Amino acid sequence: YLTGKKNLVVNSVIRRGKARADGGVGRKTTGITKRVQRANLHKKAIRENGQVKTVWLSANALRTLSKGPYKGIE
RNA sequence: CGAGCUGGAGAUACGCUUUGACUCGGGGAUGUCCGAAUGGGGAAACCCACCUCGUAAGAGGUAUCCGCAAGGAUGGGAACUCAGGGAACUGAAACAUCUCAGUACCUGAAGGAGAAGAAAGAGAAUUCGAUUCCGUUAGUAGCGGCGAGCGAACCCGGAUCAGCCCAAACCGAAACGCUUGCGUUUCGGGGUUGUAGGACCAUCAAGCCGAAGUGGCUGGAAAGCUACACCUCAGAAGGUGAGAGUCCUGUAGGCGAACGAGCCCUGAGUAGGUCGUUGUUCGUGAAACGAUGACUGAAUCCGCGCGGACCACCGCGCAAGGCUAAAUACUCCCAGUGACCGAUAGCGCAUAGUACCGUGAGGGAAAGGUGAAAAGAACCCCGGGAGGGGAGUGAAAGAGAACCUGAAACCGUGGACUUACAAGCAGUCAUGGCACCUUAUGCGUGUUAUGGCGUGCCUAUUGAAGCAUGAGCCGGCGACUUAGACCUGACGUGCGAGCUUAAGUUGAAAAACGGAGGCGGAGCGAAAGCGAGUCCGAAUAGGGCGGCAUUAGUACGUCGGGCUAGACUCGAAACCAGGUGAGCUAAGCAUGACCAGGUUGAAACCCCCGGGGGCGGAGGACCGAACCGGUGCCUGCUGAAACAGUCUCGGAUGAGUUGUGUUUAGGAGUGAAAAGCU
RNA sequence: GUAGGGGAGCGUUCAGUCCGCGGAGAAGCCAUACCGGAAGGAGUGGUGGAGCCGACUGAAGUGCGGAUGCCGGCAUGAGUAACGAUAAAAGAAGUGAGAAUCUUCUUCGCCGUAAGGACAAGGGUUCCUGGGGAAGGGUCGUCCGCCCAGGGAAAGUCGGGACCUAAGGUGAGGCCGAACGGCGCAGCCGAUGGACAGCAGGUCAAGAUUCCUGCACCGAUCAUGUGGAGUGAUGGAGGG
RNA sequence: UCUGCCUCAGACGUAUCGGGAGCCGAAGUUGGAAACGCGACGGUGCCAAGAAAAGCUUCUAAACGUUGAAACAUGAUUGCCCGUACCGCAAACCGACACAGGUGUCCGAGUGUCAAUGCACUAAGGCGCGCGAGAGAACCCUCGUUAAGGAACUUUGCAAUCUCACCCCGUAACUUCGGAAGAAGGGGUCCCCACGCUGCGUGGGGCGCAGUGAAUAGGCCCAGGCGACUGUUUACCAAAAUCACAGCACUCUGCCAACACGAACAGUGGACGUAUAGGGUGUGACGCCUGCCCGGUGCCGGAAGGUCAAGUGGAGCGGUGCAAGCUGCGAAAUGAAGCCCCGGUGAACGGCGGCCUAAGGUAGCGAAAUUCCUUGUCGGGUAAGUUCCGACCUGCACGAAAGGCGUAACGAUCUGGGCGCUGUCUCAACGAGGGACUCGGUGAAAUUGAAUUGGCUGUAAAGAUGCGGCCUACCCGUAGCAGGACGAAAAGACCCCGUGGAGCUUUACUAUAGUCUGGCAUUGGGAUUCGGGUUUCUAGAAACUUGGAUUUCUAACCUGAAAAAUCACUUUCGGGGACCGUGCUUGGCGGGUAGUUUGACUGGGGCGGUCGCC
RNA sequence: CUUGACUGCGAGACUGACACGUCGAGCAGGGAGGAAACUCGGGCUUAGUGAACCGGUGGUACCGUGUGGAAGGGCCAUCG
Numbered sequence A: 001y002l003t004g005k006k007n008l009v010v011n012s013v014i015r016r017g018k019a020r021a022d023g024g025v026g027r028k029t030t031g032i033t034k035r036v037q038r039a040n041l042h043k044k045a046i047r048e049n050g051q052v053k054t055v056w057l058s059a060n061a062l063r064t065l066s067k068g069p070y071k072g073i074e
Numbered sequence B: 001c002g003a004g005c006u007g008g009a010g011a012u013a014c015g016c017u018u019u020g021a022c023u024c025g026g027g028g029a030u031g032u033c034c035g036a037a038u039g040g041g042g043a044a045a046c047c048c049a050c051c052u053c054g055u056a057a058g059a060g061g062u063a064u065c066c067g068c069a070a071g072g073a074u075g076g077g078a079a080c081u082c083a084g085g086g087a088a089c090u091g092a093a094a095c096a097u098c099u100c101a102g103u104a105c106c107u108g109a110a111g112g113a114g115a116a117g118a119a120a121g122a123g124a125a126u127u128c129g130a131u132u133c134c135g136u137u138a139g140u141a142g143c144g145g146c147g148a149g150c151g152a153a154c155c156c157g158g159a160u161c162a163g164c165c166c167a168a169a170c171c172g173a174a175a176c177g178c179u180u181g182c183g184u185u186u187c188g189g190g191g192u193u194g195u196a197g198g199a200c201c202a203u204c205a206a207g208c209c210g211a212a213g214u215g216g217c218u219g220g221a222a223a224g225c226u227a228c229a230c231c232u233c234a235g236a237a238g239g240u241g242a243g244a245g246u247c248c249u250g251u252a253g254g255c256g257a258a259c260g261a262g263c264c265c266u267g268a269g270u271a272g273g274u275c276g277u278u279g280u281u282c283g284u285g286a287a288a289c290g291a292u293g294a295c296u297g298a299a300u301c302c303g304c305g306c307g308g309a310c311c312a313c314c315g316c317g318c319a320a321g322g323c324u325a326a327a328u329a330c331u332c333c334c335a336g337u338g339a340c341c342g343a344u345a346g347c348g349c350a351u352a353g354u355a356c357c358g359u360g361a362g363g364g365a366a367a368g369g370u371g372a373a374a375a376g377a378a379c380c381c382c383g384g385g386a387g388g389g390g391a392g393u394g395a396a397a398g399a400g401a402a403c404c405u406g407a408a409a410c411c412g413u414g415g416a417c418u419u420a421c422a423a424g425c426a427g428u429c430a431u432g433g434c435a436c437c438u439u440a441u442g443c444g445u446g447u448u449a450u451g452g453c454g455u456g457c458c459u460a461u462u463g464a465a466g467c468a469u470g471a472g473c474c475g476g477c478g479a480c481u482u483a484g485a486c487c488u489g490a491c492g493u494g495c496g497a498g499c500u501u502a503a504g505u506u507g508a509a510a511a512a513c514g515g516a517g518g519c520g521g522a523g524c525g526a527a528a529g530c531g532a533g534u535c536c537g538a539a540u541a542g543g544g545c546g547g548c549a550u551u552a553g554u555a556c557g558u559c560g561g562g563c564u565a566g567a568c569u570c571g572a573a574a575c576c577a578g579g580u581g582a583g584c585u586a587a588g589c590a591u592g593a594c595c596a597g598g599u600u601g602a603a604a605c606c607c608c609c610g611g612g613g614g615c616g617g618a619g620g621a622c623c624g625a626a627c628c629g630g631u632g633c634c635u636g637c638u639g640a641a642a643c644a645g646u647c648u649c650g651g652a653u654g655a656g657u658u659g660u661g662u663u664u665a666g667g668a669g670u671g672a673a674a675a676g677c678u
Numbered sequence C: 001g002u003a004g005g006g007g008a009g010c011g012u013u014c015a016g017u018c019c020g021c022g023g024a025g026a027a028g029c030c031a032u033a034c035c036g037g038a039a040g041g042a043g044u045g046g047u048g049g050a051g052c053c054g055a056c057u058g059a060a061g062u063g064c065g066g067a068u069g070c071c072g073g074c075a076u077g078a079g080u081a082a083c084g085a086u087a088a089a090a091g092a093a094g095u096g097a098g099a100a101u102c103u104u105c106u107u108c109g110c111c112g113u114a115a116g117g118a119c120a121a122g123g124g125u126u127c128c129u130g131g132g133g134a135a136g137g138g139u140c141g142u143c144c145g146c147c148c149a150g151g152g153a154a155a156g157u158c159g160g161g162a163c164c165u166a167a168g169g170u171g172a173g174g175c176c177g178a179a180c181g182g183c184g185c186a187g188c189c190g191a192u193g194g195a196c197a198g199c200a201g202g203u204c205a206a207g208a209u210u211c212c213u214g215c216a217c218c219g220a221u222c223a224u225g226u227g228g229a230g231u232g233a234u235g236g237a238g239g240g
Numbered sequence D: 001u002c003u004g005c006c007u008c009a010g011a012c013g014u015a016u017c018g019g020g021a022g023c024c025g026a027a028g029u030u031g032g033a034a035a036c037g038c039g040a041c042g043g044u045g046c047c048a049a050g051a052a053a054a055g056c057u058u059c060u061a062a063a064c065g066u067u068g069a070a071a072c073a074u075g076a077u078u079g080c081c082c083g084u085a086c087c088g089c090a091a092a093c094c095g096a097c098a099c100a101g102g103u104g105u106c107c108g109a110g111u112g113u114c115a116a117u118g119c120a121c122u123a124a125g126g127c128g129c130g131c132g133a134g135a136g137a138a139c140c141c142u143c144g145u146u147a148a149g150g151a152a153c154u155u156u157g158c159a160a161u162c163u164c165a166c167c168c169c170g171u172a173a174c175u176u177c178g179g180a181a182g183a184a185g186g187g188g189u190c191c192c193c194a195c196g197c198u199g200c201g202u203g204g205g206g207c208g209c210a211g212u213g214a215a216u217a218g219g220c221c222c223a224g225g226c227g228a229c230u231g232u233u234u235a236c237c238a239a240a241a242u243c244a245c246a247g248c249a250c251u252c253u254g255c256c257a258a259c260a261c262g263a264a265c266a267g268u269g270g271a272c273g274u275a276u277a278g279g280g281u282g283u284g285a286c287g288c289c290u291g292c293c294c295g296g297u298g299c300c301g302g303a304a305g306g307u308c309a310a311g312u313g314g315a316g317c318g319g320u321g322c323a324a325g326c327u328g329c330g331a332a333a334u335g336a337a338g339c340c341c342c343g344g345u346g347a348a349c350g351g352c353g354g355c356c357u358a359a360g361g362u363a364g365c366g367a368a369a370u371u372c373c374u375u376g377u378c379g380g381g382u383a384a385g386u387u388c389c390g391a392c393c394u395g396c397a398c399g400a401a402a403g404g405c406g407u408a409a410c411g412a413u414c415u416g417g418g419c420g421c422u423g424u425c426u427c428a429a430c431g432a433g434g435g436a437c438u439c440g441g442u443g444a445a446a447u448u449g450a451a452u453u454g455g456c457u458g459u460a461a462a463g464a465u466g467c468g469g470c471c472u473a474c475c476c477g478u479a480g481c482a483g484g485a486c487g488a489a490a491a492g493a494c495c496c497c498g499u500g501g502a503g504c505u506u507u508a509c510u511a512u513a514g515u516c517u518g519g520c521a522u523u524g525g526g527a528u529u530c531g532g533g534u535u536u537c538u539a540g541a542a543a544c545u546u547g548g549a550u551u552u553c554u555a556a557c558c559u560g561a562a563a564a565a566u567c568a569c570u571u572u573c574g575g576g577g578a579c580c581g582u583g584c585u586u587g588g589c590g591g592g593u594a595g596u597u598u599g600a601c602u603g604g605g606g607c608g609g610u611c612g613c614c
Numbered sequence E: 001c002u003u004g005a006c007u008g009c010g011a012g013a014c015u016g017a018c019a020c021g022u023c024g025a026g027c028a029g030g031g032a033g034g035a036a037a038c039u040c041g042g043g044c045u046u047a048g049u050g051a052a053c054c055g056g057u058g059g060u061a062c063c064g065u066g067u068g069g070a071a072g073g074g075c076c077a078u079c080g
């Protein structure tokens, strides 16, 4: 379960294939080409302390842990 | 409760019961084995253990995850709720954006509901005041290949309404932390916000009681007819030999149990930002705001967020902490009701997820009737029986268990009139013959001979007897509907310059109330706006519009059309989702088994000088059975068989054949490769 | 007079109200020469045996010849084709209501690396005995693998388990992943393989390394005696 | 450090328990044969190199004892759970059936015949296949013989003859020296006796039309095409020239390999393999060989110049405020990969031409599995030859690893000829058995608007039993035939149509898995040169950097070895290393995948033409 | 000589299913040629052409979501 930093997980968004830089700056408006989905996550870490452990953490979670222990020391 | 009971079960034997059975209401106690299954294993319901009890027979324990511990969780639910995922046919008369639709489906969590909920809101009145649901706003504002199409909210009227506690500024700790009366997280007091607050300093149950009719008549049988009565807080209903207010059960009404269920501070890796995206009417549009995936990253009450780029002013509100009943949804289950069905209907089932089909997932029938009462036919006759004929019973056996009615197609027996030189969509009209006489002695009815005339029905078509479609026949089932405060007409009713309600409230053997809101009443314009005038325009020319013809409107109802939705019924090839299949077949893997018999004669090694002899016994070698296979012909072609048989033929120690066990699958597997097998 | 528009109506079920009818007989069914302009409606008779007509109003699952329409029944082809290997059958005797077909006897013909025998999968009482004769049997049937009832099935040593491991399947911890889930060491499951103690006979109608008779073998516990001391693992080696 | 010990397969004897033909119990001999079974785990050869675990034997660790041991002898006691009947190559399993199909293993006797599980007949055993009886017509099926002829049949000698087993003699081109080969051909085959040898051989005699006396048991040869070869394929119309194949070649791949399955920094396969290996592609034994063209496309290098995204940069232009400030855009310069551009590359996609393009066919073959005209022309074979063989070449439209020419052997391959022999034929006959016919029993099916259903000729929607005229025809059946009923079966697979479908293709459109690439994060100190920042100070440089860039470092992170196989821990420890991998984002590539598009008229559609206006 | 290759309009008719298309007297503002009457809103006439959508450029000050602006939109003219 890719849930990070005992906190948060992956999300999903459609990604849209914009056919033009035209409209809104002087042309027939932008057309459309893509209706397809994607994911998005983040990556591994180490050294949990409820007593001792090592688990997934996120980028900004490693930041928050660097600026002080936060519910679970590090 | 007050005499029966011994399940359906209908079949006897056996008993039990007025010291109260049986049945009903309410508790206990037993509770094999499987199944979350949980001592370990497992192909569910079967195998194998261990530990204390220990006299044995028997009992108790032995899964995992939460927690010191109590105590909790795991699994199961028709639909309903929320969440994580998330289609495609389809419409756009093609198709990409778009729609279908966050629909189906899958998955997770929970309950009797759920979700949501107590304003950094709505919004433009310095109005409002948690959430949800209904009406209306309104198909308005908007969105949109500005196409198809999609589509809010506020105000207002209703259903129900409840608001509540923590964090933190400060006390008092304790423990630990360091240069010496301090600050990281626990525990109490205290303290909980925007008209800013707070700190520190002055009834339902099982049940019981319950009124009133007798004589004659028809009849197999009284409840019907009749004649006289009676009760009625009770004429709702069902049973009873046919239709019962007064025969039974009941009904109105009354009572009713031990245990039984039930209302100095005010939240930071955040707010905010850039990149990707997305939600609400929000399709990158001038696109705000919320939402996170990545990287960054503030401020305190002279402060922070919003008011649809953005700025100033003016307003509304205090984010980053939690809980929260009721109005809402649904229907496995129970009760009542029905301009609902009544045996091809109604649920698939008058019961069956059965029979039956499938390896499976899964699919899936037909279903009825003696009689009031079994009195269910003793006895006799033909027959092995089956079947029948009598006798009995019964009102009826014109009800006899192939048991209400019993149509039609189809099969027969008997009778009338007819037919063995005739050419024929089968009739029709005319006349003679022969029968017959119950709407019936006639302008009859049945049937005939002979004349004239005469190309089935439907559909589809320029055109059907067509050698063009459909159909064996008869029975039954079978196709222009429904919905919505939607549009537009005809007819009819009410009220009329005015007409009317919606949601709901209260009453229901009945309907009233409810003005929120909707339609007329003013038009012209892109619009601001003017206004019987208005727009174009520098004034005179026009468009539309009122006057005059003021056609009078509105709410209902029936009807003709329209729109939207399966939209007159039946019919695809296909597309997508989640599952079931490698017990056939294509392959792999592990472990086993199999190949009569015969022919040939390789290397090596030993002799004579690469040759000859000795010997040896090699091979995707040869002939050939088993076995594996399918070459050619015939047969078979409603088969012996949904791929075979006889004859013939190929391989037959190898790239061989075969058995167990197991692995691989749907855009996928497998394939000595045909798009073949799955 | 076709598509099409318009008008007036007939019949079916259900509902409300009326008028009534019915065991001296209702609906339904059956015959029919009467009536109405049509859809239709009445009269009378036969059948039936318990409900029902007429009028007015209302609401519809409301009118069938078709759809290679559905369900069901019944026909035509027709006493037709077939009766499932060209391995033949004949006589006598018996049983019986009944016999080409069942039982017996004596011959004949057919298989004989089978068309004989013993097992495994699979089937599930098909086995034996006594009865039966509807249907099943491609005819018959006294018979049957059909129907009814009663019996039959015996293991320390055979095959499996209480022993082992292969592919494969699982799998605490562990590694991954929107969810459900996907991998995975040890260990565990898993026979198609490894290990392991009996042979000869007899015999129920129906069982046989199982029961019986004869005579063995294997493990375990105990006892008597000899011995009167070292046993010697979830680990090592050989070996299988 | 010096053959011998053990074992009994099995035989023999003695005894004993059984069995034994038979009317309770007799005999149990001599000679021969012989397993895939047993002795056994024997011997020999070979390459492709042939499970694991427990039981079992042996050692200590711990513990328990060392005057109630291990072990042995006898006696006793003990012995759980499940399967076991019957069918079991089929009437009981799978095939809807009491179905001519299918189903793994074991045993499967005798006589004859080189051998044998073959063939014939038979033992034990098991069966005569659950309608029968007659008749001896047509036709149909499976068979026997056939005069004279002998392929004249036909698409084709398809079918069916012929041949057939063992022994002897004898065998060609050609060859990869094995083979072709059972080449072809010719002879023998029984019975008796005598003689020699180990059932043979030598001789003599005998009978028959005939002696593998019946059954099983090759017809052969000449010449081509294709493929070398054994083998593999379309379960159910194709077995082949298809597929594969040994051999060859190009290219990729340094090891957490390339590549492939995968939600995945997981795990696997490659492979417990490591360049003499693995993947991909194409050719296809062997022999002689594999030519010209790099312009286009692909690929490998180059990387002076042009173009190019996010990002950095933000000069300048505007709103709105009294102002402070807030705010919408927004350049130049610098930013990757890629593409343009330049070289090379063919056993890379390809190309080797019409009376300029990059070049224009080297060998070899050629009227062909390719050749239109075409039956080309000559020759061969035939009486006669569109076929076939050989030359020729005018190759519509061969050609060198989509390989070119050859090749012995192989082939249920295809094509032409010959010998032999035949009912394939002239041209059919006679015979047999199973149906067809008849009788008794049981008794279907497709089809069917209804039928009282004729001929000619004419008309009708244009092929008439049914309409018109004329002819013919007494009623009803049974056995037969196959013209008609536009006979039956499947609402035509051809064709056209539908703004239907689906499979596949590419330089059609559009996305996208995948993959490459710049920026940011994980992500860290240091030295070094630093375009520059700030306060430092007699144009100037020390505290320092915001960074970029080689370089280097070891705490991140990855990865490896050590009693602890995956993982976790220390590691005397080892290597990589701020790269990689991963997360977001930028641009490229991306038929690997995916959703779709691909007009109409049209004397059927397509091709050609044509779509508006005068 | 000069622009009538004009702005505001359009009584009436031809023509077409629409939607487009054609001809136009006369009115105003302002011009032009003529001495005048008068004729000029393109060419002897009939071909030299594209709805809508979305956008570019110039004006106008209508809309602009609390108000005052501005972003954005509308109207007029034109381009693709």
Ligand SMILES: [Ca+2]
Residues within 6 Å of the ligand: none
């Ligand atoms: Ca007959």
Ligand SMILES: [Ca+2]
Residues within 6 Å of the ligand: C080
């Ligand atoms: Ca017939």
Ligand SMILES: [Ca+2]
Residues within 6 Å of the ligand: none
């Ligand atoms: Ca002859």
Ligand SMILES: [Ca+2]
Residues within 6 Å of the ligand: none
């Ligand atoms: Ca018959």
Ligand SMILES: [Mg+2]
Residues within 6 Å of the ligand: none
């Ligand atoms: Mg979503």
Ligand SMILES: [Mg+2]
Residues within 6 Å of the ligand: B001, B023
């Ligand atoms: Mg009672």
Ligand SMILES: [Mg+2]
Residues within 6 Å of the ligand: B010
């Ligand atoms: Mg009873």
Ligand SMILES: [Mg+2]
Residues within 6 Å of the ligand: none
């Ligand atoms: Mg269990």
Ligand SMILES: [Mg+2]
Residues within 6 Å of the ligand: B037, B038
């Ligand atoms: Mg359990």
Ligand SMILES: [Mg+2]
Residues within 6 Å of the ligand: B038
């Ligand atoms: Mg338990």
Ligand SMILES: [Mg+2]
Residues within 6 Å of the ligand: none
């Ligand atoms: Mg589609």
Ligand SMILES: [Mg+2]
Residues within 6 Å of the ligand: B091, B092
């Ligand atoms: Mg569409």
Ligand SMILES: [Mg+2]
Residues within 6 Å of the ligand: none
């Ligand atoms: Mg789409």
Ligand SMILES: [Mg+2]
Residues within 6 Å of the ligand: none
């Ligand atoms: Mg649903």
Ligand SMILES: [Mg+2]
Residues within 6 Å of the ligand: none
């Ligand atoms: Mg669910």
Ligand SMILES: [Mg+2]
Residues within 6 Å of the ligand: none
């Ligand atoms: Mg649940």
